Design a protein around this nucleic acid. Sequence first.
RNA 1: AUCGAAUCGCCACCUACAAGACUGGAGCUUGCUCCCUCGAAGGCGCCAAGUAUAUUCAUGAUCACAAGACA
Lengths: 221, 169, 151, 143
Amino acid sequence: AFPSRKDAFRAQRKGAKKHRPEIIVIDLKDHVLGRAAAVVAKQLLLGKKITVVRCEQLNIAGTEIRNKIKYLQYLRKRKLTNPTKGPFHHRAPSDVFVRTVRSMLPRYTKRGMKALNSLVAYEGIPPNVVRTGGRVVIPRAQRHVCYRSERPYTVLGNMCKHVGWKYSDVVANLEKARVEKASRHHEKQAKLRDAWKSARKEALAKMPKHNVEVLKKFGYA
Amino acid sequence: KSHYICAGRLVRILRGPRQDRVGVIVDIVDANRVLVENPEDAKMWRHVQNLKNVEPLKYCVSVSRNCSAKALKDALASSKALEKYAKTRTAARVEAKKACAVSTDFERYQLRVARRSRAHWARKVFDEKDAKTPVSWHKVALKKMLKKAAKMDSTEGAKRRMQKAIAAR
Amino acid sequence: KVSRKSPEYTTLRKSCAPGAIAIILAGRFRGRRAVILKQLPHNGPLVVSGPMKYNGVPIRRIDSRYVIATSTTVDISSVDTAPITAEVFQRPKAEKPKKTLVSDARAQLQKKIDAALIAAIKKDAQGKEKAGYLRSVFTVKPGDAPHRWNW
Amino acid sequence: TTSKVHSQRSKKLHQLSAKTSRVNRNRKAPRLYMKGTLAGYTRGLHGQTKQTALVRVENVNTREDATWYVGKRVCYVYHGKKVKRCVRWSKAPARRSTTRALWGRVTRPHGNAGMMRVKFNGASVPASAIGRRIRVYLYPSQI
RNA sequence: AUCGAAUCGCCACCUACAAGACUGGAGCUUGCUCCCUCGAAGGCGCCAAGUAUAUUCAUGAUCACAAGACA
Ligand SMILES: [Mg+2]
Ligand SMILES: [Mg+2]
Ligand SMILES: [Mg+2]
Ligand SMILES: [Zn+2]
């Protein structure tokens, strides 16, 4: 992952500025696992670079016990003669989502592999993703519009924690620290947000009046 | 709180051929259907609407179930529900959406310059206020650096370097 | 009724009428707004001279398929448009082997046409706004739905 | 040698004091095409038919929307390894590049969700273009 | 330094959080009434640093990868 000295030297020779590819960051909290994965897989095949965060807060319909049992049935499948080379049962929730997307992809083609490698999965929100830009959601894969609220539902992090995932507490503490840092920084800059809001308000009295009338016509003033 | 589906409740049609029109519940068939009518709208005669396609508004006129057209019209005119609804922001947003939808290239240009003109004057007003009360990143950085800079520059050696390298310029 | 072999025969759509303001969709001046002056005879290409002072577009012919003729028009009945003939854009054959070079006659035609076009724009009630309209540059933004727009 | 922090301090103080709330303005060359992506070819479970391409265009999500683009020019841009002949090779030497284009036109909408069918001039679009950018221009214009 | 390339929206206002059986706020009458910023916009950007007194654009000759691209 570390760039080669040749690549750093070429970048210095060209004098190019810092570059970031067009990447969509999806917050997977309260998102249905299969519906989000199907949507993500289609977008990956269409050529989008997608990074998903908070994978541990994905949701699966039904009780946690039956979802844990379903994974345990998946875990029991292994090549008897040689468990190495057998199915690799990843426990991390981000790895669970990646496997679900992978099964929805044609993983045995170069095109399918390119789509799969265009996806990055995280538990929680890592610092390199926090400040990159506004996160997105999938409206047709959201719990509050997909599940009937009476039905019990499973949280992916809780399901994974009891089937082998060992970093549930680490992710929870990191998420707690991140929200506290974000809340403090959002408590700050409120004066900046309020000042800009008042600046826009005062602009109406200083700008040409026919321009105001156009704004009122199109519902902006 | 949410607005109930009751006889006399005013609703807006969410989707379909009557999208963004207003009517009155007038009657309830079952858990899924109602009988909407609005005398003042041309296309809003008494018809059946599914409850999934209606947005209950905050106004309820005083009518009975399966009321006559005259009784509905009198109640609507007396209650002033449509006039009150016209003054809200949601109604203005709905009307502005139609204006954008039927806008021409010239109208799109006029909105663009109007919004940019407001954007320019917002920047002017913000700059005037930010000069006095530092709230932006650069003004805040300057205000923190100023006190240490003045102390660091008020030395004899600082004066000599400033004068020598400025007179050289 | 009009003979199909006559220079006066045309099939051009109504939106590309003389005096209308067109958006250029291709070529060196893509995205620029311009004013339609005329159509060359024999169902030929349009001639646009959206004033070079406003946007840099000179008197150039353009196929009507490479232009969006907006519903916003300008009354250019005071513009002569007669000297703009098919012969203006013809070129002599080149034999077998930095300010832009413009022939004097082309320069005079541009001068007179643009001056009259500017005057007609001034005469319009919304002329100052339409002059800014001609200066504006059209572009396809992220999120744009040109197929859904009126023009 | 004197430390550079002093001159940097003076320059940083001047720039911070002279900073205004200026914004970034997109005054570059305009984009005159809608951006799309090649989803693949026409196919059934039996296999694909490479003579017809399927292009998904941003903001085109209805069959009525895709109808508006019928007959429009479609261009796939890529690059080779060597600089070969292009249009206006002699007239405009600045156009010479490894960049290449393959052209086509929209024939009909595909499905109900804004997908359109595209036929390329003579040959079919390469399979390496699947998932890559396609440019849908606004000409020929019916407006 | 080969190297000509495909990509074509920027931000130090989105880039914090949570709830959709309901988070603008009250009252009691508990589904109605009243108050408000009136509950259906993240800000900019799209060619004069701003809506005016303006201003060089061509012959790159009618489409051609935008012949350029640090916003
Ligand atoms: Mg719900
Ligand atoms: Mg409430
Ligand atoms: Mg190029
Ligand atoms: Zn009621």
